[PDB]
Chains A and B, each alone.
Chain A
């Protein structure tokens, strides 16, 4: 898990230079494929981390109709909400040459 408190990925959408994005592969479609797969992996990791954080503030309230205002859970969710989205993190990883990719068919 990378440091989510010091990420340089943009929070919202930005105009990314395609020449930089597809320089490593020679094809922007291939780069999008690789980045999307890395985004799926990053989303899985972030979900695991968030579930681990939320299990701490698991106030065992049996009532369901009433709305419970747990400040710590709201704070954790707020922290993970303002993070760059997994595809943005994957794009930042790709531009920094921190993604490892290989083709099974080509390597066989």
Chain B
């Protein structure tokens, strides 16, 4: 059977369910330590999965030897004394064990070793640098760690343990959207994948990869929706005699450029601000515009893609076609304004995943 689901991720805010401040602070400091150990881990794994391939290259330049990544107990040309993922997991666990859990290590190991084999093609020739993982990384945790999930009606919040620590979940005023999603797991009805966790300065967030299913509508494959995307009109869609124009040049491009201009304004004004206390306090005002316009662009892109999908479904357009998109990509590539002010890859990927969810088949030409 084919994959009847499309992967999906949700953000759930979590508070530490403890009575006093000091225990909460101890847990939060432990989790910050978990972040630091995870990032140092990711660095260790990527270095340790770079070096051995170059040892292979060294041997091949020595005598053309056919050394390959395999256990020597199972391969004559193998050099490894165990499975490669085991080698990385060992060389990180032997140093970072006893401080942060090992499921984080397993999830990170899988997540990097899966991608590095695909990147082997770009790494033998050389067009990609070894990743240098950040410090604010959302660290990953597998489904083998979620435990004691229940709905405590007394505190009006779901309770669970993220590796031996209580956690009251803060849906807030979300009594419908994700409310029947965690209950869909406490009763064993929805599948969950290896999730991640973020912490952004006092608040705690869980990036849960819930595996959601497709939605079947009454769609006609013969009916075709003609979609075009431009910087003056973000979406213009034909469906027989029905026209829909989604987005305005002022609400997408002009506000984006206004945020950019405000950022440049603060950058200019930070040169002569309070001085002598370091660069960080000078760039404090710049730090406000961290992901401002990215968030704005993402929200407007979500709204526009949702309106496009709603229009296509409401008119039973079973095939959505992007007109002349290849040529517009070509012109955007050989420009500056069009690439750095018209997010078309983000729009295209949102449309693709929101139409593969609804059954609409998307064509580009």
**Which residues of A line the B interface, CB within 8 A?**
61-63
Minimum CB distance partner of A59 in chain B:
B241
CA distance A63 to B242 in the complex (A): 11
Interface residues of B in 206-248 (CB under 8 A from A): 241, 243, 245
**Minimum Cβ distance to chain B for residue A94 (Å):** 47
Residue interface mask B237-268, A partner, CB < 8 A = 1: 00001010100000000000000000000000
Instruction: Specify which chain A residues have a CB less than 8 angstroms from the CB of B241 in the assembled complex.
Output: 61
Residues from chain A with a CB closer than 8 A to the CB of B245 are: 62
For the complex formed, measure the closest distance between the CB of B157 and the CB atoms of chain A, giving whole angstroms.
45
B residues in contact (CB < 8 Å) with A: 241, 243, 245
Give Cα distance in the complex from A61 to B241, angstroms. Answer: 9
Enumerate 5 A-B pairs (CB-CB under 8 Å) in ascending A order.
A61-B241, A61-B243, A62-B243, A62-B245, A63-B243
State the Cβ distance, B247 to closest chain A Cβ, in Å: 14
Interchain CA distance A27-B51 in the complex, whole Å = 115
CB nearest neighbor in A for B242? A61
Query: What 5 pairs across the A-B complex have the smallest Cβ distances?
Result: A62-B243, A61-B243, A62-B245, A63-B243, A61-B241
Residues of chain A lying within 8 A (CB to CB) of residue B243: 61-63
In the complex the two chains form, what is the Cα distance from A61 to B245 in whole Å?
11
- What distance in Å separates the Cβ of B314 from its nearest Cβ neighbour in chain A? 14
Min distance, Cβ A88 to any Cβ of chain B, angstroms: 38
Across the two chains, which residue of chain B brings its CB closest to A61? B243
In the complex, A62→B243 CA distance in Å? 8
Distance in Å from the Cβ of A26 to the closest Cβ of chain B?
A: 60
A93 to chain B, nearest CB (A): 43
- Bound complex: CA A63 to CA B244 (Å): 11
Question: From B243, which residue of chain A is reached at the shortest CB distance?
Answer: A62
Complex interface: chain B residues within 8 A of A63 (CB)? 243
The residue on B at minimum CB distance from A60 is B243
- Of all chain A residues, the one with the shortest Cβ separation from B245 is A62
Closest to A68 in B: B241
Q: Give the docked Cα–Cα distance between A71 and B243 (Å).
A: 19
CB distance from B236 to the nearest CB of A (A): 10
Residue numbers in B under 8 Å from A61 (CB-CB): 241, 243
Q: Report how far A61 CA is from B243 CA in the complex, Å.
A: 7
**CA of A48 to CA of B282 in the docked complex: distance in angstroms?**
66
- Shortest CB–CB separation between residue A30 and chain B, in angstroms? 54
Q: Which residues of B contact A62 (CB under 8 A)?
A: 243, 245
How far apart sit A52 and B191, CA to CA, in the bound complex (Å)? 53
Q: How near does chain A come to B230, taking the closest CB pair, in angstroms? A: 16
CB distance from B96 to the nearest CB of A (A): 61
Q: How far is the CB of A48 from chain B (nearest CB, A)?
A: 29
The smallest beta-carbon distance between B234 and chain A, in angstroms, is: 15
Cα A58 to Cα B208 in complex, Å, equals 46
Q: Roughly how many angstroms separate A63 CA and B243 CA in the complex, as a whole number?
A: 9
A63–B245 Cα distance when bound, in Å, is: 11
Bound-complex Cα distance A56 to B243 (A): 19
Q: Which residue on A lies nearest to B244, using beta carbons? A: A62
The distance in angstroms between the C-alpha atoms of A84 and B241, with both chains bound, is 36
Bound complex: CA of A1 vs CA of B241, how far in Å? 36
CB distance from A3 to the nearest CB of B (A): 36
Q: Provide the bound-state CA to CA distance between A63 and B241, in Å.
A: 11
Cβ of B164 to closest chain A Cβ, rounded Å: 59
Nearest Cβ on chain A to B79's Cβ, whole angstroms: 68
Least distance between B283 CB and chain A CB atoms (Å): 46
- Report how far A84 CA is from B245 CA in the complex, Å: 43
When chains A and B are docked, how far (Å) is the Cα of A34 from the Cα of B243? 50
- Nearest Cβ in chain B — how far from A68, in angstroms? 8
Q: How far is the CA of A11 from the CA of B354 in the complex (A)?
A: 59
Determine the distance from Cα of A29 to Cα of B241 in the docked complex, in whole angstroms. Answer: 54
A64: min CB distance to chain B, Å? 12
A62–B241 alpha-carbon span in the complex (Å): 11
Complex CA–CA separation, A25 to B243 (angstroms) = 59
Shortest beta-carbon distance, A100 to chain B, in Å?
Answer: 49
A57 to chain B, nearest CB (A): 14
Taken together as a complex, chains A and B put the C-alpha atoms of A32 and B245 apart, in Å, by: 54
- Give the residue name and chain of the B residue nearest to A63 (CB): B243
B297 to chain A, nearest CB (A): 25
